[PDB]
Design a protein around this ligand. Structure first.
Ligand SMILES: [Zn+2]
Ligand SMILES: [Zn+2]
Lengths: 307, 307
């Protein structure tokens, strides 16, 4: 309820800011604003994926197609959100390089600064909505959206700072009379412009930005992508389980121990444990289940192989 | 061995064509060629992800970190490849729109056509290498690479066709004397050009292209993303398993059956099956294992709950 409400609220603000970008571009007759609107549509797609994962995760319930439920679906949502962000971060890095090799002037700096401030306010509102997620499957699913919100919030901050630096320290050649543009090599033409450091302010910061994101993206793409690989949860180690099951009387060996994490705090472990006396099997198995519960594994399947 | 050889060969050709693009851009002094080279670097990243998945999938061995192995890692590689491709298809769609709202002229059509033909030859070689995959994971990891190769091969075909149509049917205004450019609205300026249909040839085809890719991408993103959700394999249905286990004498009920697919043809099913007589448990369990093998489930775990 609360999570879906937050996601729907952020989606609604994202459409509203999309409409704001479109109408502002229409009055100003600018196309890069439309491109930024379509990037906001990419953000809409990320929010939609998060919403799909969050609904479907409620199924739980033993269905015919999935006997476990659909909480792992939420986990997958987190995972896919993380991979879309690694990808958009890599696209930002490739755009930054493309702007290093060819700088781009910013036209109409004031409206760009205003739209950047509006987007910063929207992204800060979204960040406050998603602050609680810096049980777990919910934490991962909300962390994906939180990382997307942090990414486009940092983008808004970069845009605002760049627009301010352009408006305060860039002397353009758009006047049209006796102006030479050293930094931007060919001003499309068949005084001296502003210092060349400003024209590269957008790329460098962007690069720094993606690094930040990549850093903060790495745990999620680590945490979500190891649950679906059925890696043993970090709280659980296999040596202690093996030795404690071997120390239990009535246990000859523990031939095949499989431990994995379904989603969040639901850890599933199945083992085969050899026993000699069928009569003692029930108390041996209850002790084994007690050990599994002691170490935090609550759903188990134990097959006794009488010899 | 063979799969890693194919992946390394395609990676080597991809670096060689990257170097070709870079050197051609250097002699021609063109920047969009560098952008295409960085897109080829994105293809390099996809191939690298595939290589990592393939290399890690050969571990198995029931590592301490993962008691099942790392074949699911290969599955995840397939999945992430699919996701990456969907994202690039959506970026192509957003670039196509950006070119619909603002068409772009193609400069130096002959060198673009030649580089497109070279890339088409490289991509056809890669497609022939990956033709065999239109175990199962081996297929999924390669189908991911096959879809990437098909995508940039279709991109090369689009580039070649567009360059040919420009060279044959576009009358540019680059001569500099008495030329008006109706289609491209402002030719950056403070006769009649070629017909306006050519300037939009690249977007429309691109859109069609992504549709194709998206279509062919959907099964992979369906097939890989349902294995990691532990959905029951399509060959297996739960009603027959339940009824056949109930019909077995000595079985009171099958209380929990979870059946899922690890990777490829390795299907794992665990169940609880209440039995009355411990003496009859061994033959009852061997019959149950025989049924599980009969339906194609070879790794099981069956816990008898004596009452
Ligand atoms: Zn066994
Ligand atoms: Zn039970």
């Amino acid at each position: 309820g609360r999570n879906r409400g937050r996601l729907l609220c952020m989606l609604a603000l994202t459409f509203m800011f999309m409409v704001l970008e479109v109408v502002v571009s229409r009055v100003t007759s600018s196309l890069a604003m439309l491109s930024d609107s379509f990037h906001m549509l990419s953000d809409v797609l990320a929010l939609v994926v998060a919403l799909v994962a969050e609904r479907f995760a409620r199924r739980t319930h033993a269905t015919q197609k999935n006997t476990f439920g659909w909480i792992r679906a939420e986990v997958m949502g987190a995972l896919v959100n993380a991979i879309f962000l690694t990808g958009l971060c890599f696209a930002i890095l490739l755009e930054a390089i493309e702007r290093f090799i060819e700088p781009h002037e910013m036209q109409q700096p004031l409206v760009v600064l205003g739209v950047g401030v509006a987007g910063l306010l929207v992204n800060v509102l979204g960040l406050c909505l998603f602050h609680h997620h810096s049980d777990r499957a919910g934490q991962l699913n909300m962390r994906g959206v939180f990382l997307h919100v942090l990414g486009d919030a940092l983008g808004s901050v970069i845009v605002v700072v760049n627009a301010l630096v352009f408006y305060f320290s860039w002397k353009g050649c758009s006047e049209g009379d006796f102006c030479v543009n050293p930094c931007f090599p060919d001003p499309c033409k068949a005084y001296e412009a502003g210092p060349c450091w400003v024209l590269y302010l957008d790329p460098t910061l962007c690069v720094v930005m993606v690094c930040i994101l990549l850093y903060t993206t790495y745990p999620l793409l680590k945490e979500s992508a190891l649950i679906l690989l059925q890696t043993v949860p970090k709280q659980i180690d296999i040596r202690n389980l093996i030795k404690e099951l071997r120390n239990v009387e009535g246990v000859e060996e523990v031939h095949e121990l499989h431990v994995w994490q379904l989603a969040g705090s639901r850890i599933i472990a199945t083992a085969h444990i050899k026993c000699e006396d069928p009569t003692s099997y029930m108390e041996v198995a209850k002790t084994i289940k007690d050990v599994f519960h002691n170490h935090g594994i609550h759903a188990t399947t134990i097959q006794p192989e009488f010899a």
